[PDB]
Amino acid sequence: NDTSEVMLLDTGWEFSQSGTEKWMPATVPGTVHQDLISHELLPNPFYGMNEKKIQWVENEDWEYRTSFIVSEEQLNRDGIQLIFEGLDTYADVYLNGSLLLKADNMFVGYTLPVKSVLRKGENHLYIYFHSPIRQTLPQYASNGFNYPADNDHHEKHLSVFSRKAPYSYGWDWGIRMVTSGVWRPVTLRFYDIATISDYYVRQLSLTDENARLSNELIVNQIVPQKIPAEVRVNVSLNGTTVTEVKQQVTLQPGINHITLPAEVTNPVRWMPNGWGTPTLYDFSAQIACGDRIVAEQSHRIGLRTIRVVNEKDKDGESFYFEVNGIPMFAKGANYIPQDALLPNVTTERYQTLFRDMKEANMNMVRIWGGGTYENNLFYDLADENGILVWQDFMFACTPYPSDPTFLKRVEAEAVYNIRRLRNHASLAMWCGNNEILEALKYWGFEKKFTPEVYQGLMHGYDKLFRELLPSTVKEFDSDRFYVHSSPYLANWGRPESWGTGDSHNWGVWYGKKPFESLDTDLPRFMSEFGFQSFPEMKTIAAFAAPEDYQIESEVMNAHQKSSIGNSLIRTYMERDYIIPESFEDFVYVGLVLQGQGMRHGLEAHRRNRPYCMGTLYWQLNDSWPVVSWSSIDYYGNWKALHYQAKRAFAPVLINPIQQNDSLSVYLISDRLDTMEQMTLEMKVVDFDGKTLGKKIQVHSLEVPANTSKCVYRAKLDGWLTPEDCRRSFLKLILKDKSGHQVAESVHFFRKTKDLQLPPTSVSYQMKQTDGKCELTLFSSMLAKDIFIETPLQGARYSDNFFDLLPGERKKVIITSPRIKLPVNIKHIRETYK
Ligand SMILES: OC[C@H]1C[C@@H]2[C@@H](O)[C@@H](O)[C@@]1(O)CN2Cc1ccccc1
Ligand SMILES: [Br-]
Ligand SMILES: [Br-]
Ligand SMILES: [Br-]
Ligand SMILES: [Br-]
Ligand SMILES: [Cl-]
Ligand SMILES: [Cl-]
C-alpha cells in the first residue's frame, strides 16, 4: 500500500524436456507433471496402475522460459527485485545472460536485485531444473551407506540429501511423484528508496489492561545517499485506528534496524475455536519519504498468550497448552499435503479444509514433518478460524545428514520460515522432526549399520535437532516452545514411558490392539493414533474401473501403501462386525468401523483429563485417491470418522463407558463457564421403539468449566439381561434447569455383530432445490450406522453415519453447487443374510 509496483510473472511460460529443443506452454506456479498432463504427455497419474507409468519424469532435466517487457520509466526506479517464493529444487536461474541464482532448497524464498541486469524492451528469464535424482546419485555414491528412509520408494534413499518435500519420493499413504518447477509465485518489484525485508510484531506483555508490543523492521535501502524518513505503525480493528506511533530516522545505504513500541489498552484477545472470537488486529508499517510512502507492510495480529507446559510431575512429564492463562485440552488431527502436486491445491480447497476442521470442533492441527511449511494462506485461515498450529520442521522417519554444508542449508530454511510464520496468531510451537529419535532408538538400526556409522547418526541427530534448530528458534522466535522430536520420549510398546510427554500410540493398527485398549493405555498428550479405511465408492470409481472393485485387484493394490493394510482392516472388522460378502458392503462397514473405533479413543482421551491433555488423530486428509487413515478422502468427502470426530469433540459431551459388565456415565465440558442445576436423563429402548422399564433421572448435576466428571454408575446385572443388551439401546440426554437440551448420546451394550438387528427399510422424502437437498428419513425399526450415499463428488451433509432410531423422523440437508439426485441408503442389517 505504497509507491511500489509489482509485475506478476504468471503468464507466458513455456517448458521443455532438456535435450529435445521442443517447447510447449506451461502454467506457473505449477509442476513439470501437470504441464505434461495438460498436453496429454502423461496419463492421469492417479488412475489404476499408472504410478509405474509416470516415474520416467524424475530422470530427466526440465527447462522453463518466459519473457517480459520493462519500460524506460520502470528501469529508472531506484530498485528492482525479482522474488521466487519457491523453486523445487536444483534450479539455475538466468536472466539476460546472468546466472542470478543456483537454488537448492524447496522451502526457501529468494529475493534477488536485478535492476543492473534488466533491459528496456524484452527480457528473458530461463530456469534450468536439474533432476533431484541425478543431482543426488553422486552424493549417494560417495556416502558408503543407505539412509533407512523406507518411505522413499526407490532402492537408493536419495530423499535425505535434498531439502525437498519428503512425501514427494513416496510414503505409506502416498504416490511417488518426484516433481520439479516454479511452485510458488514469481514477482517483480519496481520501487523507490527501500523495501521492508521483514516486519515483526513482538509481543512483550499482555494483561487484560494492556498489550505491549515491539514493532521490529529490517529496511533494505538501495540508494547511495542518506535518506531521512519517518517510520509509522498504524494499529486498527475493523478499519478504525486503535493506536498510532511514528519515529524519525535517517536511513543508511543497506540494512537498517528500526524498533517502535506501541501499546493497546484493554486489548480484545484472540480466542481459540470454542472459546470465543479469533480477533485479529491490523498492524500496518510504512516508510514515508517526503510526501511519498515508499514501502509498506502489514500483518494481522492476534493478541493472546500461548504457553506449552512440559514439566515433571507425579505422573511423569506433563505436555499441554495453556491459552490466555487457561489450560486448553487440544482437539484435532495431523495434516499432510493436500495433493501430490502442490500448486494444484486451490484457494477454495484450503478454505474448505479449514471449514472441515472448524465444523468438527477442532482447535489444533499438526503440520507434520514429511510435507511442507505451508503457504501463507494456510496460516491466515488458521488465524481467522481459531485453530492452533503445531509446526514440525520438515524432517520425518529417518536420521538425516549433518555435515557442515547440509546444516547451512537447513539453517536458511529455518530462518526463512520462522520469519515467514512468527507473526501468525495461530502459531503455537515448533517441533524438530517426526519420529526420528524413536527411529534411532527402536527401529533396529544398530543391526543394519556399523557401530561407527550408527554413532555418526546419533551425533548427527544432536547437531541438527538439539543444537541448530532449538538455537535458531531461540534467536528468531524466542517466546515460542520448541521440542526436538514427536514423540520425544514415549514409546508405544514401553508402558513405563507413557507418563512422559507426548505419545504416538501405534499399538492400535501396527500393534493389532483392540480399540478398547485406548481406555487403559493413556498418554499425557496423544500426538498420533489412527486406523485405516477404504474411501467410499465414488472415490474408488475415480481410480478403479468396475472390473477392479476387489480388495486385491492390481488397481486396488496400487492404492494401498501399507502392505499390512487390507488384511488388517478385515481382522479388526471381524472382531466387531459381520464381514459382508460384497466389496461395496465391505467399504461401507469399513467406514463405520474406522469411525466407531477411533471415536472410542478420542472419547477416552477427553474423559481422562487432566492426566491426558490433548488428542490429535492420524490423519485429517489425503494427497490423492488411496486407502488411508484419513477422515476426509482426496475429493473432500467426509468419511464416518469426520462426523464421529465432530461428535467426540463437541464442547459438552455425554460419554457412557461400559467396562467389566458395568456402565459409567461422564460429563465432559471444554466450556469456559460452569453449568449448574443440570439433569441427566436416560432410557433403555428396544429396536421397535419401545421403552424398557422406566426413565432414569439424575438431578442437581454441575459441569465445571474444562473438566471430565463421573455422575452415574450402574452394574448391568439385575438391570438388563444378555438378550436385552443385544436387542435395545441407552438414550442419554442432558437438560438445564428449565428442561432445555444441551447434549445427547446413544449407547449400545454389545458389539454390532452381537446385535439382533431387525430387517428394516429406510424411507425418505426429497425436496430438491438449487444446490440444496432436504431429506426426511423414517424407519419403524432401528437402522444401524446409516450411510446416505450420492454419486455427487464433494457433496456436504448436515449429518451422516448416524443411527436412525425407531420411529423418529430425521432431517438431513445435502448441499453441492451442482444440485439442479441419486440417493442410496445403506445400513448394517442390509449387509448380511
Ligand atoms: O503409518 C502412517 C503414519 C503414522 C506415523 C506418522 O508420523 C507418519 O509418518 C506415518 O506415515 C508413519 N508413522 C508410523 C510408522 C513409522 C515407521 C514404520 C511404520 C509406521
Ligand atoms: Br536493485
Ligand atoms: Br534486493
Ligand atoms: Br541500523
Ligand atoms: Br554401515
Ligand atoms: Cl462403551
Ligand atoms: Cl462390558
Short mmCIF file of C-alpha atoms in Angstrom, two decimals, residues 334-546:
data_model
loop_
_atom_site.label_atom_id
_atom_site.label_comp_id
_atom_site.label_asym_id
_atom_site.label_seq_id
_atom_site.Cartn_x
_atom_site.Cartn_y
_atom_site.Cartn_z
CA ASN A 334 -2.37 -34.41 11.78
CA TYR A 335 -2.28 -32.53 8.42
CA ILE A 336 -0.44 -33.85 5.25
CA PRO A 337 -0.11 -32.18 1.83
CA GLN A 338 -3.47 -31.75 0.11
CA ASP A 339 -2.04 -33.03 -3.24
CA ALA A 340 0.88 -34.88 -4.89
CA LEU A 341 1.16 -31.67 -6.99
CA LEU A 342 1.09 -28.75 -4.55
CA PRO A 343 0.32 -25.85 -6.93
CA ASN A 344 -2.91 -27.69 -7.84
CA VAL A 345 -4.25 -27.01 -4.31
CA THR A 346 -6.54 -24.03 -4.89
CA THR A 347 -7.68 -21.19 -2.54
CA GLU A 348 -11.11 -22.93 -2.30
CA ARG A 349 -9.58 -26.31 -1.31
CA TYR A 350 -7.65 -24.52 1.52
CA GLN A 351 -10.82 -22.74 2.69
CA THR A 352 -12.97 -25.92 2.66
CA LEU A 353 -10.37 -27.82 4.73
CA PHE A 354 -10.50 -25.10 7.36
CA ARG A 355 -14.29 -25.19 7.35
CA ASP A 356 -13.97 -29.04 7.83
CA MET A 357 -11.71 -28.56 10.90
CA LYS A 358 -13.84 -25.77 12.35
CA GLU A 359 -17.02 -27.79 11.88
CA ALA A 360 -15.51 -30.89 13.57
CA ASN A 361 -14.92 -28.74 16.70
CA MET A 362 -11.13 -28.71 16.27
CA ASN A 363 -8.82 -26.20 17.99
CA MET A 364 -5.48 -27.62 16.68
CA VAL A 365 -3.68 -29.04 13.60
CA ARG A 366 -0.21 -30.57 13.39
CA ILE A 367 1.61 -29.73 10.14
CA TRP A 368 3.64 -32.96 10.11
CA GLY A 369 7.29 -33.06 9.04
CA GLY A 370 7.15 -35.04 5.78
CA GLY A 371 5.18 -32.37 3.90
CA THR A 372 5.90 -28.64 3.51
CA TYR A 373 6.00 -25.46 5.60
CA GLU A 374 2.59 -24.46 4.37
CA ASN A 375 1.66 -21.37 2.41
CA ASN A 376 0.72 -18.05 3.99
CA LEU A 377 -2.99 -18.71 3.15
CA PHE A 378 -2.97 -21.88 5.33
CA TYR A 379 -1.86 -19.83 8.36
CA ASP A 380 -4.15 -16.87 7.61
CA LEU A 381 -7.07 -19.38 7.65
CA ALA A 382 -5.83 -20.90 10.95
CA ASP A 383 -5.69 -17.34 12.50
CA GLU A 384 -9.19 -16.45 11.35
CA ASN A 385 -10.65 -19.83 12.34
CA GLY A 386 -9.07 -20.13 15.79
CA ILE A 387 -7.04 -23.31 15.10
CA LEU A 388 -3.67 -23.55 16.92
CA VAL A 389 -0.81 -24.67 14.65
CA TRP A 390 1.83 -27.21 15.79
CA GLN A 391 4.60 -26.84 13.18
CA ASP A 392 7.12 -29.72 12.61
CA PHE A 393 10.35 -28.91 10.82
CA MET A 394 10.37 -30.78 7.52
CA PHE A 395 12.22 -33.91 8.87
CA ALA A 396 10.44 -37.34 9.24
CA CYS A 397 11.00 -41.06 9.96
CA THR A 398 14.78 -41.27 9.26
CA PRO A 399 18.01 -39.88 10.56
CA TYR A 400 19.42 -37.13 8.23
CA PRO A 401 22.87 -35.96 7.19
CA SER A 402 24.57 -33.50 9.47
CA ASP A 403 27.67 -32.30 7.55
CA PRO A 404 28.56 -28.57 7.63
CA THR A 405 27.10 -27.80 4.18
CA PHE A 406 23.85 -29.68 4.82
CA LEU A 407 23.39 -27.74 8.07
CA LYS A 408 23.94 -24.34 6.45
CA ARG A 409 21.13 -25.13 4.01
CA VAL A 410 18.79 -26.27 6.81
CA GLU A 411 19.64 -23.11 8.82
CA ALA A 412 18.45 -20.91 5.91
CA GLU A 413 15.12 -22.74 5.59
CA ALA A 414 14.75 -22.45 9.40
CA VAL A 415 15.50 -18.68 9.46
CA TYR A 416 13.37 -18.20 6.29
CA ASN A 417 10.24 -19.95 7.50
CA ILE A 418 10.48 -18.85 11.17
CA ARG A 419 10.36 -15.18 9.99
CA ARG A 420 7.67 -16.05 7.46
CA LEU A 421 5.49 -17.54 10.20
CA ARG A 422 6.21 -15.80 13.52
CA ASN A 423 3.52 -13.16 13.15
CA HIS A 424 0.65 -15.72 12.99
CA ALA A 425 -1.72 -15.77 15.99
CA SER A 426 -2.32 -19.48 15.17
CA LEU A 427 1.40 -20.46 15.56
CA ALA A 428 1.72 -22.36 18.87
CA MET A 429 5.01 -24.39 18.82
CA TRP A 430 7.92 -25.79 16.72
CA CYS A 431 8.97 -29.47 16.66
CA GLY A 432 12.27 -30.62 15.22
CA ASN A 433 11.06 -33.76 13.48
CA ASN A 434 8.67 -36.65 13.28
CA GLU A 435 9.75 -39.95 14.90
CA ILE A 436 13.50 -39.78 14.23
CA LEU A 437 14.71 -40.36 17.85
CA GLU A 438 12.23 -43.23 18.19
CA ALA A 439 13.62 -44.48 14.86
CA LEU A 440 17.15 -44.24 16.18
CA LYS A 441 16.32 -45.95 19.49
CA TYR A 442 13.83 -48.63 18.46
CA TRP A 443 13.71 -49.38 14.75
CA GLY A 444 16.68 -51.77 14.83
CA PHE A 445 19.30 -49.50 13.15
CA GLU A 446 22.13 -50.99 15.34
CA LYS A 447 21.84 -54.30 13.36
CA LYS A 448 21.82 -52.54 9.97
CA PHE A 449 24.95 -50.32 10.20
CA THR A 450 28.50 -50.49 11.55
CA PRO A 451 28.93 -49.22 15.13
CA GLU A 452 30.86 -46.26 13.68
CA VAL A 453 28.07 -45.33 11.23
CA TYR A 454 25.35 -45.71 13.97
CA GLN A 455 27.28 -43.32 16.25
CA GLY A 456 27.69 -40.77 13.48
CA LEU A 457 23.91 -40.86 13.08
CA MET A 458 23.44 -40.33 16.86
CA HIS A 459 25.99 -37.43 16.99
CA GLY A 460 24.39 -36.01 13.80
CA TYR A 461 20.98 -36.07 15.42
CA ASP A 462 22.09 -33.87 18.30
CA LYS A 463 23.86 -31.45 15.87
CA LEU A 464 20.64 -30.71 13.98
CA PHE A 465 17.79 -31.28 16.49
CA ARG A 466 19.28 -30.36 19.93
CA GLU A 467 21.71 -27.66 18.73
CA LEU A 468 20.96 -25.90 15.42
CA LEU A 469 17.11 -25.91 15.38
CA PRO A 470 16.49 -25.07 19.10
CA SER A 471 19.04 -22.25 18.85
CA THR A 472 17.55 -20.75 15.61
CA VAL A 473 14.16 -20.74 17.30
CA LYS A 474 15.63 -19.20 20.44
CA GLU A 475 17.03 -16.41 18.25
CA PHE A 476 14.07 -15.67 15.96
CA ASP A 477 11.01 -16.90 17.89
CA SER A 478 12.16 -16.64 21.41
CA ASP A 479 8.79 -16.88 23.16
CA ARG A 480 7.63 -19.97 21.22
CA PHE A 481 8.07 -23.51 22.55
CA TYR A 482 10.40 -25.93 20.70
CA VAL A 483 10.74 -29.72 21.21
CA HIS A 484 13.35 -31.83 19.44
CA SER A 485 11.03 -34.65 18.30
CA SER A 486 7.46 -36.03 18.34
CA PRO A 487 7.21 -38.28 20.24
CA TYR A 488 10.03 -37.05 22.45
CA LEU A 489 10.42 -39.94 24.95
CA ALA A 490 7.30 -42.09 25.00
CA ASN A 491 7.16 -45.29 23.05
CA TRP A 492 4.07 -47.42 22.28
CA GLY A 493 5.42 -50.80 23.43
CA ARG A 494 7.06 -49.44 26.57
CA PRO A 495 4.22 -48.69 29.13
CA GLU A 496 6.68 -47.25 31.65
CA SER A 497 7.23 -44.31 29.27
CA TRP A 498 3.56 -43.31 28.67
CA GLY A 499 3.61 -40.68 31.50
CA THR A 500 6.48 -38.79 29.84
CA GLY A 501 5.35 -36.14 27.32
CA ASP A 502 3.57 -36.96 24.06
CA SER A 503 2.62 -40.36 22.51
CA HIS A 504 2.19 -41.76 19.03
CA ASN A 505 0.04 -44.73 20.11
CA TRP A 506 0.53 -47.14 17.26
CA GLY A 507 -0.46 -50.17 19.37
CA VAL A 508 -3.77 -49.69 17.64
CA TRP A 509 -3.19 -50.58 13.97
CA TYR A 510 0.56 -51.59 13.99
CA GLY A 511 0.36 -53.46 17.30
CA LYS A 512 -3.03 -55.08 16.48
CA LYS A 513 -4.52 -53.96 19.85
CA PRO A 514 -8.37 -53.63 20.16
CA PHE A 515 -9.90 -50.13 20.26
CA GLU A 516 -10.77 -50.87 23.93
CA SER A 517 -7.07 -50.64 24.79
CA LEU A 518 -7.31 -46.78 24.33
CA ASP A 519 -9.40 -46.83 27.54
CA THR A 520 -6.45 -48.29 29.50
CA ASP A 521 -3.30 -47.22 27.53
CA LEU A 522 -3.38 -43.47 28.25
CA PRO A 523 -0.98 -40.71 27.18
CA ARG A 524 -0.23 -37.25 28.69
CA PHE A 525 -0.99 -35.96 25.18
CA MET A 526 -1.90 -38.08 22.09
CA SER A 527 0.01 -36.58 19.12
CA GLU A 528 -0.85 -39.55 16.87
CA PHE A 529 -3.12 -42.58 16.79
CA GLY A 530 -5.03 -43.92 13.85
CA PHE A 531 -6.84 -46.54 11.84
CA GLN A 532 -7.30 -47.01 8.10
CA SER A 533 -10.33 -47.20 5.77
CA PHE A 534 -11.00 -47.56 2.02
CA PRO A 535 -12.68 -44.36 0.69
CA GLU A 536 -16.35 -44.55 -0.37
CA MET A 537 -17.28 -45.93 -3.79
CA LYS A 538 -17.44 -42.68 -5.82
CA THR A 539 -13.76 -42.24 -4.87
CA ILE A 540 -12.82 -45.84 -5.82
CA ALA A 541 -14.59 -45.29 -9.21
CA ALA A 542 -12.24 -42.25 -9.60
CA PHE A 543 -9.25 -44.57 -9.76
CA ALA A 544 -10.70 -48.10 -10.45
CA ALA A 545 -12.86 -49.36 -13.33
CA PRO A 546 -15.87 -51.57 -12.42
#
